[PDB]
Amino acid sequence: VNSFSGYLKLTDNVYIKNADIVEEAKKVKPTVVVNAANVYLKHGGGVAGALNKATNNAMQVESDDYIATNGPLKVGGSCVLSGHNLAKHCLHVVGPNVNKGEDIQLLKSAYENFNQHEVLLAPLLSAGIFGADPIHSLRVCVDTVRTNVYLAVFDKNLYDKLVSSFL
């Protein structure tokens, strides 16, 4: 049993809810919250900007130190850092950004990072301002992630479309 409430069960291991991931993290304090990161860990907008704002910029300060030491992530790669006030850990995962012309085949590689964690609160990778089709992102998630993933979908209209169209 875990603390996640109000989710619709899509598969054995994938659950979905219309929720603000920031507000969900603050309530649950999951072991792992996933950030929709870029390779520079520049948390300007989208899910990353919202998560970072909720940490009072402490996520960005920590991220800048990481990049200064390690250099940029790979597209499809991830980095576990602090979860600050939101979670124990934040798994920063880089999905391909279609609005930068990145290979959508890298979305499966991105989701494979989730398999290193038994339970996660996450957004749909490469959705929103990363430009991919969220229906596609949900299909790759279900077909890739084997650990237990609780997906937060901010937009109610999109949530209802994801559920209604789910095979």
Point out which residues bind ligand EKZ (CB under 6 A). Answer: 66, 73, 77, 79-81
Helix, strand, coil percent content, the chain, rounded in steps of 5: 40, 20, 40
Q: Residue 7 or 66: which CB sits closer to ligand EKZ?
A: 66
Q: Residue 6 or 71: which CB sits closer to ligand EKZ?
A: 71
Q: Residue 40 or 66: which CB sits closer to ligand EKZ?
A: 66
Report d(CA 42, CA 91) in Å as an integer: 14
Q: Residue 92 or 154: which CB sits closer to ligand EKZ?
A: 92
Least distance CB 93 / ligand EKZ (angstroms): 10
Least distance CB 80 / ligand EKZ (angstroms): 5
CA distances (Å), 103 to each of 6, 55, 106, 146, 149, in order?
34, 31, 6, 23, 24
Which residues, at least 6 apart from 165, have a Cβ–Cβ distance to it below 8 Å? 135
Which residue has its beta carbon closest to ligand EKZ? 79
